[PDB]
Amino acid sequence: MPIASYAQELKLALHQYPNFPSEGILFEDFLPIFRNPGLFQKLIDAFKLHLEEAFPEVKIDYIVGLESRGFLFGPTLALALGVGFVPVRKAGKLPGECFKATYEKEYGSDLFEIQKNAIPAGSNVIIVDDIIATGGSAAAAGELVEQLEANLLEYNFVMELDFLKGRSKLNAPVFTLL
Amino acid sequence: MPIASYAQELKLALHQYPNFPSEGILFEDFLPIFRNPGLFQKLIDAFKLHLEEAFPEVKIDYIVGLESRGFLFGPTLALALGVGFVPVRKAGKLPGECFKATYEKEYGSDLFEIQKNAIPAGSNVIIVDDIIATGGSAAAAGELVEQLEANLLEYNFVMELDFLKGRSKLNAPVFTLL
């Protein structure tokens, strides 16, 4: 059926890569989806249909995409929904005043930013990305949305993979298409 | 003229930032465009209008976008045109067999990749990105398209900025919207 029909076709288009990006990790490459407009259309329609059914009476203001894979489908989904798109980037890339969030890893940390004036306080947003695994960048994006005094309605991911490092807690509902 | 109207309105949405990313460079941020679906669509319509005039009797097979600002509008443009999208990424990120190209800077280098199986030989391609300044990544992307034995029809950029380091030679015509 509908969302499930699209999910099925998209799953079959993924390419499996064992031991990537590290040994033991079974990677799934979604890039083939973008190479074919027929498949790309179904990816966007699947998320659009999901959001229309998940929030029939709640207004979505922005799609927040995570660098860089979330940039591949997030902006198009935003346009398809008639809403704005705002990126979360690795620190040091965005111009202007930015809110910052840190993801502490075993060794070192990952810094993320979002432009302070990009989303008004009270806005409702959906954070999107390709893969949800350890969840570091997703959790960080969540903190940034909170600093903007915006509401995180849900996270939308294309897939879930096991990067062998456990899972960081996400403080919002999660929908994973595949 | 339609494309003139789009360009003028899009230019007004840009935000200036002195000395970014480094001292002496006057940056222009196009991110506000994506925050407004009406403006975002005008950006897409502007590039569509250009390509329809530039390649009336030539089939475009793929839009190749550069990481990561090219990912913000490249996929969207691709789907709007009904063609495929393929990313060029900084080395070490893409899964699968990849072609490699190096951008030699004065005191370092930037390595780029494209998946070998992403584009069939003989395909017609348009490379897109936000800013054309030094042209380093753009030149590397051109070399990658050549390794795929594909035809580079043109480069499409949103804007041109002066990064104070000259501009590398590009082996294909260039179109800059703003």
Side-chain angles (χ1 to χ4, degrees):
Chain A
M1 309 298 269
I3 292 180
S5 183
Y6 289 159
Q8 176 76 350
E9 205 171 316
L10 296 164
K11 172 186 174 184
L12 302 177
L14 304 176
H15 190 283
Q16 193 176 72
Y17 288 104
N19 307 300
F20 185 87
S22 302
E23 187 185 4
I25 302 175
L26 189 59
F27 197 81
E28 295 288 358
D29 175 27
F30 81 153
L31 291 175
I33 290 170
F34 304 92
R35 301 172 186 170
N36 185 163
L39 296 174
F40 193 1
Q41 287 166 179
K42 296 185 175 180
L43 181 66
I44 301 304
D45 276 321
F47 281 118
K48 181 174 181 294
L49 290 174
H50 168 254
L51 292 173
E52 299 180 318
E53 306 195 309
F55 306 93
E57 302 181 300
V58 172
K59 181 181 179 181
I60 294 175
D61 296 296
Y62 302 85
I63 290 300
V64 172
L66 314 188
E67 187 180 347
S68 288
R69 295 178 174 137
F71 292 2
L72 295 173
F73 71 101
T76 300
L77 173 60
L79 209 43
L81 291 170
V83 307
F85 175 84
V86 171
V88 162
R89 298 206 65 178
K90 305 192 304 302
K93 299 294 184 178
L94 293 169
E97 298 296 338
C98 291
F99 280 125
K100 282 197 295 292
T102 304
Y103 170 42
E104 277 70 5
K105 300 181 297 184
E106 67 294 288
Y107 308 133
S109 304
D110 280 348
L111 303 173
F112 302 87
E113 290 181 309
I114 197 163
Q115 294 177 310
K116 292 196 185 180
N117 304 86
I119 300 175
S123 300
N124 291 326
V125 313
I126 303 291
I127 286 175
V128 307
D129 199 2
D130 174 22
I131 297 154
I132 174 58
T134 310
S137 57
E143 289 181 354
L144 293 169
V145 168
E146 172 65 12
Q147 289 187 63
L148 285 164
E149 295 187 359
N151 302 299
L152 180 54
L153 298 179
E154 206 188 32
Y155 284 91
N156 279 194
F157 303 108
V158 173
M159 63 178 84
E160 179 187 306
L161 295 176
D162 185 356
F163 271 44
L164 312 179
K165 294 178 276 297
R167 309 179 181 181
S168 292
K169 289 289 189 175
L170 296 183
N171 300 300
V174 175
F175 171 72
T176 297
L177 184 62
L178 308 182
Chain B
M1 185 175 269
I3 197 170
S5 294
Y6 296 153
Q8 70 179 184
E9 186 169 0
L10 290 166
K11 184 171 68 176
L12 294 174
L14 302 183
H15 195 134
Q16 295 194 311
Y17 293 100
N19 306 302
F20 185 88
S22 62
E23 299 159 63
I25 302 174
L26 182 54
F27 199 78
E28 292 275 20
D29 177 24
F30 79 156
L31 290 177
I33 290 169
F34 303 90
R35 300 175 190 166
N36 187 296
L39 286 178
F40 188 2
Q41 182 57 220
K42 290 181 184 302
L43 179 70
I44 299 301
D45 288 333
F47 281 120
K48 291 185 65 177
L49 211 51
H50 171 258
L51 298 172
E52 302 178 321
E53 185 189 14
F55 306 96
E57 309 300 304
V58 182
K59 177 180 180 61
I60 299 177
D61 298 296
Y62 303 81
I63 293 299
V64 171
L66 310 191
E67 190 183 346
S68 67
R69 288 172 178 144
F71 290 3
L72 291 170
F73 71 98
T76 307
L77 174 61
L79 194 54
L81 294 173
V83 305
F85 174 83
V86 172
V88 161
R89 301 206 63 180
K90 302 178 180 182
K93 302 179 171 62
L94 290 167
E97 303 289 339
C98 293
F99 282 129
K100 301 167 174 291
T102 302
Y103 164 25
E104 285 186 295
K105 295 182 294 184
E106 302 185 69
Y107 313 116
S109 289
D110 283 345
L111 188 67
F112 301 87
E113 294 180 304
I114 199 167
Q115 294 172 308
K116 293 186 178 184
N117 295 173
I119 298 172
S123 299
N124 291 326
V125 179
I126 296 297
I127 289 174
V128 306
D129 199 1
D130 169 26
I131 298 149
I132 174 57
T134 66
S137 60
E143 310 193 316
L144 292 172
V145 171
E146 179 186 298
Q147 295 185 63
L148 287 164
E149 301 291 64
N151 303 301
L152 181 55
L153 296 176
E154 205 187 34
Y155 285 89
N156 280 196
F157 302 105
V158 171
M159 68 181 78
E160 185 186 310
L161 295 181
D162 186 356
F163 273 48
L164 318 169
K165 301 296 184 177
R167 179 174 173 180
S168 60
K169 298 296 180 298
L170 301 180
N171 301 165
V174 170
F175 171 71
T176 300
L177 184 64
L178 310 176

